[PDB]
């Protein structure tokens, strides 16, 4: 059982992805990173419950067609028969969005604990790439920190997160700090204080 | 099919993962290495398919299934499922390539600038884990709470230790009328529990 390995389509289309077999049905399968592969077509093209109507499935050769491409059917499709190597399907022209920046403070319990971190929580964003620069009152910081690798989400939708680490005694040395999110050359900048 | 999130050997140990349901139906399991489709490596609790090695053995005692894997090699390290009738969420299986390390974990309350927006988002902060695979479950007061819950999938940070951040969506509302709210992340079978109140 040999499969494309990748293909792709814009919202509304129609795609369709390729595939002993002769005489047996094939099955598919449906995998999103991260979780187990879920059933979507059965012999040759009845499909599951909760499946969408949009499947549909058909039979020395197999095929998936999926009608009115959405986001979230971005995933890898297995052929199987009594599996074949995979189908990566790319769902193009979805539409740009600008982050949504949250920063937050240390806590009382933190400093308390004589530490101190500020996380620059960075979500719903669209395309997954962004860039983090912080900011000591108004100058560079150029020590301490981290950025994730924007992961996608529920909502289709990329969301990472920078966090800073400091002593208690550079966060109050300091009037405010800054976090900055560069995302398709347009900058979200957040600020914070004792 | 209930199924451990993650599990973890040297090599050349015997590792073994669970799978619990399921009393009138046999269980398969499956192989997936990285980039690679799911390969049967186990069918009818316990019949190895033909290229299977014989270290792989299943079983099954009761309303529960097992897989056990002697010998392990590093060519082992992949996710693993189980599949009844009437597919288990998978166990992550690492093979480690360095010393284990516990999560630290960090909570904070809602930002003062955000509140001023009607939006209330708790963050709950984990770094210097590895593996590189946790579970989080946020409770309010003593209750569970799912509703708003989005983890990122973790990622190596520059101390060659993972990292990622679970956050909770909430209304002031939602934030000012229970006593505390709880984050717990599950690490190699433990659990740490962090807490904030308003």
């Known amino acids: 059982?040999?499969?494309?390995?990748?293909?792709?389509?814009?919202?509304?289309?129609?795609?369709?992805?390729?595939?002993?077999?002769?005489?047996?049905?094939?099955?598919?399968?449906?995998?999103?990173?991260?979780?187990?592969?879920?059933?979507?077509?059965?012999?040759?093209?009845?499909?599951?419950?909760?499946?969408?109507?949009?499947?549909?499935?058909?039979?020395?050769?197999?095929?998936?067609?999926?009608?009115?491409?959405?986001?979230?059917?971005?995933?890898?499709?297995?052929?199987?028969?009594?599996?074949?190597?995979?189908?990566?399907?790319?769902?193009?022209?979805?539409?740009?969005?600008?982050?949504?920046?949250?920063?937050?403070?240390?806590?009382?319990?933190?400093?308390?604990?004589?530490?101190?971190?500020?996380?620059?929580?960075?979500?719903?964003?669209?395309?997954?790439?962004?860039?983090?620069?912080?900011?000591?009152?108004?100058?560079?910081?150029?020590?301490?920190?981290?950025?994730?690798?924007?992961?996608?989400?529920?909502?289709?939708?990329?969301?990472?997160?920078?966090?800073?680490?400091?002593?208690?005694?550079?966060?109050?040395?300091?009037?405010?700090?800054?976090?900055?999110?560069?995302?398709?050359?347009?900058?979200?900048?957040?600020?914070?204080?004792? | 099919?209930?199924?451990?999130?993650?599990?973890?050997?040297?090599?050349?140990?015997?590792?073994?993962?669970?799978?619990?349901?399921?009393?009138?139906?046999?269980?398969?399991?499956?192989?997936?290495?990285?980039?690679?489709?799911?390969?049967?490596?186990?069918?009818?609790?316990?019949?190895?398919?033909?290229?299977?090695?014989?270290?792989?053995?299943?079983?099954?005692?009761?309303?529960?299934?097992?897989?056990?894997?002697?010998?392990?090699?590093?060519?082992?390290?992949?996710?693993?499922?189980?599949?009844?009738?009437?597919?288990?969420?998978?166990?992550?299986?690492?093979?480690?390539?360095?010393?284990?390390?516990?999560?630290?974990?960090?909570?904070?309350?809602?930002?003062?600038?955000?509140?001023?927006?009607?939006?209330?988002?708790?963050?709950?902060?984990?770094?210097?884990?590895?593996?590189?695979?946790?579970?989080?479950?946020?409770?309010?007061?003593?209750?569970?709470?799912?509703?708003?819950?989005?983890?990122?999938?973790?990622?190596?940070?520059?101390?060659?230790?993972?990292?990622?951040?679970?956050?909770?969506?909430?209304?002031?509302?939602?934030?000012?009328?229970?006593?505390?709210?709880?984050?717990?992340?599950?690490?190699?079978?433990?659990?740490?529990?962090?807490?904030?109140?308003?």
């Open positions: 399921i009393e009138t139906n046999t």
């Open positions: 199987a028969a009594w």
């Open positions: 599949a009844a009738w009437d």
